[PDB]
Amino acid sequence: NLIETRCVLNHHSTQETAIGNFFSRAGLVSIITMPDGYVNWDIDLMGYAQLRRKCELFTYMRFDAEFTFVVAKPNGVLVPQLLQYMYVPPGAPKPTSRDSFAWQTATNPSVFVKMTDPPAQVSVPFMSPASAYQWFYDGYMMGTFSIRTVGTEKSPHSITLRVYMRIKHVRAWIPRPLRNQPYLFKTNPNYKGNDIKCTSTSRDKITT
């Protein structure tokens, strides 16, 4: 129910419609829970729907990442417990067992933090062999995160952690029309052909 009063007469700053601010805010990308200790994730942007639509406005993007792992027991409480977060570059072996040699390899960086410390923070640079990422390939990855509780024992504490993404130094190319249909798969842009949702709403008559 719109109203008429309280008009605005001054122009706002244009620095805040820039491409950097449009992606500056950091948001959740995944939720990881551990009731097998490996929970190996996979860095991606086509995860939560609201980020797969704002990022598909362009075709080529180049940026960095900045993670933050907030980890606690399911009911909030924190306990003294050591943790290991492992990063697997695009082309390194992926862990398959809790006691595999990947957990002890040296070329894969890792961070060891207890629960009581402030959440760990890690920045990931641009890694694609090409000049920039592309969300649309007409022809015919960023890495891997593995989380494990350190120790040959079995940790008697359920683990739930959330990963947050921040995007820095964003460059975009070739703007593309925004998607207006529900998503079906995380890889290809398919749509339900049985029905088509009109972009706009509907009214009774063109004159009303």
Binding site: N1, L2, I3, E4, T5, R6, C7, V8, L9, H11, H12, T14, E16, T17, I19, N21, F22, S24, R25, A26, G27, Q50, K54, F58, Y60, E66, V70, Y87, P89, P119, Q121, V122, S123, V124, P125, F126, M127, S128, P129, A130, S131, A132, Y164, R171, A172, W173, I174, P175, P177, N180, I196, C198, S200, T201, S202, R203, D204, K205, I206, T207
Partner: protein
């Protein structure tokens, strides 16, 4: 000799050590069509969806243009809508309307471009009137003429642009919107010689002007 101040050991989402210090990323190359600001996107013509009738949902391809016919007398209203990019309605189908949902407050001037898509051997006259914000929809052609209007005829020129002076918004579930109403009037009846089709169509395009600007961000 320092003492920690309140605000330590806290994670603020709007506030790091690199993971691969020895990694050299691939140098960038020149790719044409770089976007430096979202405003350069909002300043392109896009097709308005004015004929958004209830019966057109089954066949949405007919929603992009509204018809003008020979069975209409002179003086009757043809179409009417308000200039509200943020709200629902015809403006939901434009890039400006789609990008207006990601921001809370915006202000600036818009522009609307119409285009005739009839036969070459067809002439007439049509009236475009813009009621200033706060007023009512004009009751008749003689009342709409006194306001701001342009006499658009398709006997010589096939396109015309109309400029909205100023709009603004302040989202709060209601918003303080100051917008006008755009009406299309039948100045003269659609005349046409023999052999040519009797009905035509009009395409409406809209885009922002130079002085458009948005404010605090949201998520749709």
């Amino acid at each position: 000799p320092t003492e920690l101040k309140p605000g330590t050991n806290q994670f603020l989402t709007t506030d790091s050590a690199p993971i691969l210090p020895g990694f050299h990323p691939t140098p960038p190359i020149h790719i044409p069509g770089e976007v430096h600001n979202l405003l350069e996107i909002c300043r392109v013509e896009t097709i308005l969806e004015v004929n958004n009738l209830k019966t057109n949902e089954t066949t949405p391809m007919q929603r992009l243009c509204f018809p003008v016919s020979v069975q209409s007398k002179t003086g009757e209203l043809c179409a009417a809508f308000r200039a509200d990019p943020g709200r629902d309605g015809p403006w939901q189908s434009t890039i400006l309307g789609q990008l207006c949902r990601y921001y809370t407050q915006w202000s600036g001037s818009l522009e609307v471009t119409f285009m005739f898509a009839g036969s070459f051997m067809a002439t007439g006259k049509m009236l475009i009137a813009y009621t200033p914000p706060g007023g009512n929809v004009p009751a008749d052609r003689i009342t709409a003429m006194l306001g701001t209007h342009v006499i658009w005829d398709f006997g010589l020129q096939s396109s015309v642009t109309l400029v909205v002076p100023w709009i603004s918004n302040t989202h709060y579930y209601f918003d303080y919107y100051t917008t006008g109403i755009i009406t299309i009037w039948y100045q003269t009846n659609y005349v046409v010689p023999i052999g040519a089709p009797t009905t035509a169509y009009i395409v409406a395009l809209a885009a922002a002007q130079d002085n458009f600007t948005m404010k605090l961000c949201k998520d749709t």
